[PDB]
Amino acid sequence: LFPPQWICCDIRYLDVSILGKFAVVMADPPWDIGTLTDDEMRRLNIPVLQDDGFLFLWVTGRAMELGRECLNLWGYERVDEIIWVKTNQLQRIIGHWLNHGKEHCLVGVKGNPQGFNQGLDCDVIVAEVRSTSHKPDEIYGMIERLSPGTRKIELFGRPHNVQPNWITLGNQLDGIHLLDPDVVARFKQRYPDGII
Amino acid sequence: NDYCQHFVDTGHRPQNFIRDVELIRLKDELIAKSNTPPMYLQADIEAFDIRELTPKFDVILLEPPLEEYYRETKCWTWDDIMKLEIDEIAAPRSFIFLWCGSGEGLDLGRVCLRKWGYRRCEDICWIKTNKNNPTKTLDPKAVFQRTKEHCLMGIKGTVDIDLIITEEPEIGNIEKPVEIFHIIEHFCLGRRRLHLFGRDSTIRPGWLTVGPTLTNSNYNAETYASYFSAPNSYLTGCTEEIE
Numbered sequence: 078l079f080p081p082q083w084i085c086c087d088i089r090y091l092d093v094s095i096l097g098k099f100a101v102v103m104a105d106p107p108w109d110i111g112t113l114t115d116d117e118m119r120r121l122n123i124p125v126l127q128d129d130g131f132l133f134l135w136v137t138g139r140a141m142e143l144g145r146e147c148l149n150l151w152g153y154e155r156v157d158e159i160i161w162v163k164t165n166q167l168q169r170i171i172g173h174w175l176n177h178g179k180e181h182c183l184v185g186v187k188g189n190p191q192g193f194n195q196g197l198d199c200d201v202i203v204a205e206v207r208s209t210s211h212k213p214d215e216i217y218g219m220i221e222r223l224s225p226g227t228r229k230i231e232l233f234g235r236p237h238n239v240q241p242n243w244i245t246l247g248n249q250l251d252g253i254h255l256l257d258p259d260v261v262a263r264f265k266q267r268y269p270d271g272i273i
Numbered sequence: 274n275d276y277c278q279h280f281v282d283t284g285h286r287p288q289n290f291i292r293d294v295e296l297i298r299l300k301d302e303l304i305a306k307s308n309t310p311p312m313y314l315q316a317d318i319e320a321f322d323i324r325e326l327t328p329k330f331d332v333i334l335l336e337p338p339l340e341e342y343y344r345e346t347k348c349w350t351w352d353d354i355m356k357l358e359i360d361e362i363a364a365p366r367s368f369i370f371l372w373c374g375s376g377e378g379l380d381l382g383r384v385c386l387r388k389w390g391y392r393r394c395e396d397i398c399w400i401k402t403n404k405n406n407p408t409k410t411l412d413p414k415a416v417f418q419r420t421k422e423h424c425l426m427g428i429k430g431t432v433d434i435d436l437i438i439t440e441e442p443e444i445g446n447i448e449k450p451v452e453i454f455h456i457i458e459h460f461c462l463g464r465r466r467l468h469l470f471g472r473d474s475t476i477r478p479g480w481l482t483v484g485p486t487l488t489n490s491n492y493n494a495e496t497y498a499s500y501f502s503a504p505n506s507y508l509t510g511c512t513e514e515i516e
């Protein structure tokens with residue numbers, strides 16, 4: 078079901094097996110640098126979400142190493158690294174040793190994904206800063222050109238992240254909004270009274 | 274404006290459109306008065322006992338020749354790099370700047386830093402513009418076109434941004450932007466500075482350069498250690514010389 082969908086929840090405790098498989102998974106976690114400890118990030122049930130495809134994992138500070146850990150533990154090989162160069166409205170650029178002009182997003186592959194449009198975009202994003210902690214909308218266009226029309230899931234999204242073809246999970250979303258019939262089916266079976 | 278869509282349209286990388294890409298002058302002069310005479314030494318570093326290089330260093334810049342720098346052109350594998358005994362010539366408090374490329378080096382280079390005992394504090398990015406040439410041949414694993422390189426910064430023991438924007442060098446030109454040197458010297462980390470896998474073209478005041486392709490050598494360990502004997506043992510490299 079093509080339009081936006083979302084589930085307010087605690088991603089620690091949601092039975093993500095109800096959601097099916099996704100060509101792309103994206104995660105912008107609140108790293109302990111309402112955060113999660115490092116053992117809670119390792120234990121997240123990412124491995125069930127995909128059989129073949131890509132993972133996009135934002136990192137910062139020491140999660141640069143730790144996100145490589147989760148990425149490998151969850152069954153991925155890191156194959157690329159996107160960086161976003163933060164500018165203002167006039168295209169000039171905005172860690173205790175150097176000032177930070179960028180955010181990092183690891184790209185991980187699992188299994189053998191086929192029919193993806195590898196090579197279309199390049200690993201640098203240049204785009205204006207929006208709110209605090211607010212990732213740029215350009216990543217969705219890159220992710221749609223890479224794998225058009227497939228199902229995608231975002232972990233730790235906020236309301237502004239909800240996108241067509243995407244299912245957003247995060248604890249600041251407004252309720253449960255699900256339209257894919259299989260997902261609605263497995264969701265009512267596992268959660269008959271709608272409490273997680 | 275979506276510069277990623279624009280790059281998909283026109284072949285102009287998003288970094289092509291970054292614009293613009295004090296007392297800093299005085300610090301640069303103090304660095305320049307502080308600098309040791311440049312010293313350099315041809316050495317096949319695979320075959321070379323690293324421990325001959327003394328004294329222990331405050332900064333190590335490590336620029337191994339990755340096979341990926343030769344797209345259309347002796348390369349070192351991360352296997353070879355990881356076996357270097359970098360920790361034997363590093364001071365107990367010291368810094369490393371390791372050029373990792375854009376592939377598996379982003380992971381393997383982190384393993385080295387831990388193997389030699391450093392923690393990573395900065396990830397410095399060389400973003401390469403293609404203003405003078407709106408095509409790439411992809412690594413099989415690659416998902417996106419690779420338009421940047423990473424220089425990882427490491428610390429062991431107790432002004433500038435983390436981006437370098439320059440135009441993509443000509444095919445088969447493997448030089449790294451000399452801006453990495455300014456970022457290092459501005460940290461004021463001490464004066465024993467080693468550049469492994471430098472070339473004739475990278476020799477520089479304030480630095481010792483060791484590489485297989487150097488055509489001349491002037492390195493003498495006793496002369497080199499003379500530059501830092503008292504009263505000069507602990508200078509940051511950013512202070513006035515002691516009389």
Ligand SMILES: CC(C)[C@@H]1[N@@H+](Cc2ccc3c(NC[C@]4(O)CCCN(c5cc(NCc6ccccc6)ncn5)C4)cccc3c2)CC12CCC2
Binds near residue numbers: 209234246
């Ligand atoms: C480069 C990256 C790394 C950088 N990110 C940093 C970032 C990312 C997301 C931010 C955010 N996301 C919205 C949330 O819902 C808010 C709350 C926590 N969280 C959870 C947690 C959870 N379980 C634990 C739990 C529950 C209840 C009580 C305690 C613990 N279950 C569902 N959601 C996400 C909100 C505010 C700031 C964020 C900052 C951003 C970038 C990209 C640009 C920089």
